[PDB]
Amino acid sequence: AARDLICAQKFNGLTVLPPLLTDEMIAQYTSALLAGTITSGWTFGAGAALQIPFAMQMAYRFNGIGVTQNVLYENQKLIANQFNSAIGKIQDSLSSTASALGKLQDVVNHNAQALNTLVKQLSSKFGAISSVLNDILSRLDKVEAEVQIDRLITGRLQSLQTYVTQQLIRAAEIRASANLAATKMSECVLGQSKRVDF
Amino acid sequence: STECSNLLLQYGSFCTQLKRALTGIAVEQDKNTQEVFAQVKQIYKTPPIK
Amino acid sequence: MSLGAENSVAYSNNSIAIPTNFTISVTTEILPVSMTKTSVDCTMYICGDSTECSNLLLQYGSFCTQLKRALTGIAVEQDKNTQEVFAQVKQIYKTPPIKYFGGFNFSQILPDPSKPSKRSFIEDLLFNKVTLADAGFIKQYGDCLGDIAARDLICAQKFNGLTVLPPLLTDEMIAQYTSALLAGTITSGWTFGAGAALQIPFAMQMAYRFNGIGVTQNVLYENQKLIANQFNSAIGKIQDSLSSTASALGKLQDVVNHNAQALNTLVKQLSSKFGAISSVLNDILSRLDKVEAEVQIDRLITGRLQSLQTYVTQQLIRAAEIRASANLAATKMSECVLGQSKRVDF
Amino acid sequence: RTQSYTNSFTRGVYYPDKVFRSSVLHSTQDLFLPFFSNVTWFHAINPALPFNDGVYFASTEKSNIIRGWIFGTTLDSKTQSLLIVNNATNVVIKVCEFQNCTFEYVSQPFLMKNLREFVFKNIDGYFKIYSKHTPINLERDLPQGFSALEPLVDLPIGINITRFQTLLAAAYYVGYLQPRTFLLKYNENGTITDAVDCALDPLSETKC
Amino acid sequence: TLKSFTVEKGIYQTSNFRVQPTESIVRFPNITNLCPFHEVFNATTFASVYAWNRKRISNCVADYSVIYNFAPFFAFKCYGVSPTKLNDLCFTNVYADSFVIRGNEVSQIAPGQTGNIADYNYKLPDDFTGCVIAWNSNKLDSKPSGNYNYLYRLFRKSKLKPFERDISTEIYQAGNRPCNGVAGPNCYSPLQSYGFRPTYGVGHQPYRVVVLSFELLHAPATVCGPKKSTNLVKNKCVNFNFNGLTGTGVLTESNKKFLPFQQFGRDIADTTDAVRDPQTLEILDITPCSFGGVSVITPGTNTSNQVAVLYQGVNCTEVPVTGSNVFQTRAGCLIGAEYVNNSYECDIPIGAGICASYQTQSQSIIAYT
Ligand SMILES: *[C@@H]1O[C@H](CO)[C@@H](O[C@@H]2O[C@H](CO)[C@@H](O)[C@H](O)[C@H]2NC(C)=O)[C@H](O)[C@H]1NC(C)=O
Ligand SMILES: *[C@@H]1O[C@H](CO)[C@@H](O[C@@H]2O[C@H](CO)[C@@H](O)[C@H](O)[C@H]2NC(C)=O)[C@H](O)[C@H]1NC(C)=O
Ligand SMILES: *[C@@H]1O[C@H](CO)[C@@H](O)[C@H](O)[C@H]1NC(C)=O
Ligand SMILES: *[C@@H]1O[C@H](CO)[C@@H](O)[C@H](O)[C@H]1NC(C)=O
Ligand SMILES: *[C@@H]1O[C@H](CO)[C@@H](O)[C@H](O)[C@H]1NC(C)=O
Ligand SMILES: *[C@@H]1O[C@H](CO)[C@@H](O)[C@H](O)[C@H]1NC(C)=O
Ligand SMILES: *[C@@H]1O[C@H](CO)[C@@H](O)[C@H](O)[C@H]1NC(C)=O
Ligand SMILES: *[C@@H]1O[C@H](CO)[C@@H](O)[C@H](O)[C@H]1NC(C)=O
Ligand SMILES: *[C@@H]1O[C@H](CO)[C@@H](O)[C@H](O)[C@H]1NC(C)=O
């Protein structure tokens, strides 16, 4: 008996298409990038992957940022302990605090709310005598029924145009964020960045 | 509703360009996901030593 | 679908892999910069020489003033995008008549004075591979005045009040900017983007680039002929790819086709009744008396105004997208061409 | 009268209106004939044939056995009947509404290895006749190609027709018309050269 | 246009120029016959609504404005056209249907209604165009003993199609027993007779209804009203009236291969591209008259009051809708600014490589590359 909002969204003609890439394939791409950036340095982003020990790769990163590599090679255990403690700290922070993923939560909530408003818009009269179309067809004659039908069509068409325009603007914003994320994946993960606060 | 469809046919080609815009958005989202994640040419694997 | 070929790099704590040879790869990156500039006449589009329709349209306020202002802003923004992308050099440098650059062969990317337009081989292939229409540029009303049975779509687009403006910078001026940038880069390196151009031999400039990427210059100086041969073969491979494949310029093809489809839809929206009894304004004014005719003309005016507002909104969104792409192209020009970039996959 | 069944092979389109269009793809919903339909072949060496919203008629007999047609609900009396009997000396479209005459009409042009492709339509009391002659080689079955039909005669009858009968050794193809949407291609000279049936297969649905 | 008193330096598109029509031409077929509306609106009696007569009218000079002098009716109730605009445009064929009903059912003569007359006697289509005339006839078709000459059908198996009759009189099968031509239980006659009396109320009085059904211009025009023709003119921007089709344009010869059954030629956006002349069988083209856009190029109003005019998209051997300077550009052409063989920075952009500026060395507006 409990009718969900998704049931009314499907029954009123608003469906949702699944993405082409599933979460298993996204996780496989992420695992491939992690395995490359752990076992091969940055060279996989500039041709074939060339294997290298991780201590020497940290030495190359230290020499890139401007610290002589003896500082790394004399403090390897301390640097490993600090990295492990930072990984455990960010794991515990994601375990405890739930207010960090608000951007993705807003991405979900906007596309839920727009479809909810589009379904809720169907219950309006728009200056006609009844919001139900079959009530007007059952009650009135042809010409006056066509007048009320024309009012309802104009109102629902304006609502659909407003929804499409809002979706286009949100698509532009999401595309800009995805371009920034692609640039960050190209420059942070596949190499070493000299840009401040990037 | 056949009568509503018959009065909807006289309003032009609004719904065709609405469908075109929604299809463009749906293609663009998967293009964004592809161009963010699929940047490595091969699939690497960590050796069993850890 | 397949994500790619599976690999497993042999990693140990005392093994390394070091390259012993190299390859020189030339790749092609295509970015849109500007699109078609349009102007729309409201009275000609909606009414078309009808005083009753004009008097009914005058009661709707100032929709068309802000529509014309938005289209004028887009048309100015296209020229601003083209100027920002290309006009980055202060003096028009030209190549010296000697054409030796240490074995490197730039004869087939530099312009030649034989053609009436100073456009190179690859520039002519790119200008021919994109099926850019004439778009009503050279006196479209004079072209449409002829007694030809093949009625063009541009004829109806012009007759319905939709005009396509020509750009401020012509293709000859764009090619002159491209030639100046190419000659400055070849003859002076990165020094022409940070002041006056300082001449330097091209082998030593390539040694500076090798020292920038982290390879000692004796590697170039002991492999100069091999590197020149690889570069020439790569440029020939680019010409063969651009001669054979025609699907590489899909971005510019989409830039043309979206404007063509938008103008075609705006023309085809004039044949709809919009709830009235006829789609012909003179037929309505001839069949009906004043009050009922005013009712039908008001319905047609509302429908055509909705179509025009939809076209202007989609043009604004596409103009924002094209402006973002033009800013990316300008940044890519200023970083890749005028200098050397350490940014990975940039 | 022996009855065989054969295939239409994308034949029997017509100009839907008396306007001119050049190099424009145009979509029309009208009483058309579906492509690759089950057209019915009759050989006469005889009940009343059913009528259902227009009939397509084809024949190959050049010595004019098929003279005219008789329409109506019943055969002779007790209802409203039609009589479009024609002969070969002068071409007459003499129409009788005796069953008490209420509609008479006579006019010349109805008839001019030949296909006389006719289409008869009855919409809202208006009776429309489409006619086109076509040369043929290999006269068995039906040819492959496109040959549009043109408007000939309109009449204001204002009855029902639910049965029709040809007036007579002879062989003729009878096809049935349905309300259908077509996508017609106008040429540079205004000639219908190609058409797509919008509800035939998903490829033609994608084309439409 | 800018709604201000001070205009800064730049280019502004202002309005649209358009060449005006000079004369007007009206083309009508040469018809001299007068079809008799008089014999339709003057009769000794009208037929019953189950057996309504239908008169087809063509080849006429249809004078509608005299119709008010034949019958005493209030409203000339039209559904598709205007009652006062019938003398200008013209049709293909006219149909006149005359019958007599009672005053309760005169509202039923309308497109798309359900009742007794509109279901079983006289059904009008949903896309009906034409006019309906109704007038009282209590002094002509009413008798004190009872006028029973008018009958109507109230029993049928199915509803009537638009514009059709059913005059067959067979006994209605209202149950399961066969009637066999004998009335009685569950077997009623389909025709019931009117019982008109002069002492009834105003709603039961007999009314005479004449319906004029019109056909739109898709065929060659056979009936057209009293409008005088005008001699044909060509190669000038003229207002044309072709068989009620009013437009503004210039006429030329057309090499289009029109079929003999085709009268009009259509565009993509539903515009009459070509027309066949009604008097002589000739095909003519329609081209819209010359138009474009006008842009004003000016410096600031604090500097000078001199402007230049750019006409967009037109060749300018045809300027008429200082004044001695005309320079041909790609974006139209320029009037009021002189072209020099120099090169400076772009002050005011115009078009494909051409800019304009204000110069001192007398001060004037110059156009350069
Ligand atoms: C590095 O690669 C280049 C080209 O990939 C090699 O040059 C080739 O050498 C062979 C034999 O010496 C010739 O047959 C080819 O024609 C050369 N190719 C070109 C394009 O010139 C070069 O030998 C390689 N270097 C090393 C040390 O192996
Ligand atoms: C530099 O490049 C040009 C252009 O590719 C080369 O000219 C070609 O030479 C081959 C062999 O002689 C001819 O078959 C082609 O027809 C030429 N093309 C053109 C456009 O001239 C040139 O050989 C190259 N090398 C130099 C100048 O040393
Ligand atoms: C180095 O690698 C070998 C082989 O996997 C392993 O046995 C050894 O323990 C590694 N060295 C250290 C310090 O873990
Ligand atoms: C037409 O229908 C008959 C029905 O028996 C069938 O046998 C015949 O194959 C059909 N013709 C076709 C599908 O071409
Ligand atoms: C013709 O008359 C028959 C009576 O048997 C009826 O069923 C049919 O509906 C009538 N035709 C139309 C088009 O209504
Ligand atoms: C149109 O007709 C002309 C002559 O009647 C002919 O030359 C031309 O080829 C035709 N166009 C076609 C068949 O597309
Ligand atoms: C009408 O005019 C045409 C052309 O002048 C002429 O051929 C025709 O005979 C005229 N009709 C009448 C009835 O005079
Ligand atoms: C109606 O027309 C007839 C035609 O002969 C005429 O005799 C009669 O007088 C007319 N009726 C009136 C009231 O004038
Ligand atoms: C149109 O303009 C061009 C360019 O000035 C000119 O050569 C041509 O003669 C013009 N056409 C006319 C005047 O018909």
XYZ file of C-alpha atoms in Angstrom, chain A residues 19-21 26 29-30 32-33 35-36 39 44 47 49 133 137 146 149-150 153-154 157 160-161 164 167-168 171 174-175 178-179 182 185-186, chain B residues 1 3-5 7-8 11 14-15 17-18 21-22 25-26 28-47:
70
model
C 25.120 5.012 -16.367
C 27.297 3.168 -18.867
C 30.153 2.474 -16.428
C 35.112 2.539 -11.806
C 40.075 1.962 -13.098
C 40.889 3.404 -9.659
C 44.772 0.351 -11.941
C 45.739 3.992 -11.318
C 48.823 0.183 -8.757
C 50.579 2.267 -11.407
C 54.711 0.390 -8.409
C 53.303 5.224 -16.710
C 54.748 6.004 -21.891
C 55.538 1.837 -16.871
C -7.997 15.712 -17.447
C -13.487 15.160 -20.683
C -10.608 22.004 -25.560
C -7.235 21.274 -22.069
C -5.327 24.110 -23.777
C -1.216 21.937 -21.746
C 0.238 25.465 -21.598
C 4.590 22.743 -21.002
C 8.634 21.130 -18.353
C 10.591 23.936 -20.057
C 14.846 21.418 -18.746
C 18.886 20.781 -15.776
C 20.976 22.388 -18.544
C 24.843 20.131 -16.383
C 28.780 19.618 -13.267
C 30.833 19.627 -16.498
C 34.379 17.279 -13.911
C 36.939 19.162 -16.025
C 40.121 15.446 -14.695
C 43.696 13.413 -11.800
C 46.130 14.172 -14.633
C -5.779 11.005 -23.907
C -7.939 14.611 -27.617
C -5.052 15.977 -25.541
C -2.597 14.358 -27.969
C -4.203 19.397 -29.313
C -0.575 18.652 -28.370
C 2.158 23.180 -30.567
C 8.966 21.743 -28.411
C 9.131 18.169 -27.157
C 14.125 19.618 -28.721
C 13.363 18.843 -25.060
C 18.487 18.436 -24.691
C 17.897 15.610 -22.193
C 22.847 15.854 -20.942
C 22.691 12.053 -20.575
C 27.596 14.368 -21.529
C 27.486 12.799 -18.044
C 29.020 9.540 -19.279
C 31.549 11.530 -21.318
C 32.534 13.317 -18.083
C 32.923 10.021 -16.197
C 34.984 8.514 -19.045
C 37.303 11.519 -19.355
C 37.853 11.660 -15.587
C 38.480 8.000 -14.799
C 39.599 6.246 -18.007
C 43.002 7.885 -18.407
C 45.313 4.867 -18.080
C 45.777 2.801 -21.234
C 46.185 -0.566 -19.460
C 45.093 -2.232 -16.216
C 47.923 -2.681 -13.721
C 48.150 -5.008 -10.729
C 50.040 -4.927 -7.449
C 52.467 -7.836 -6.925
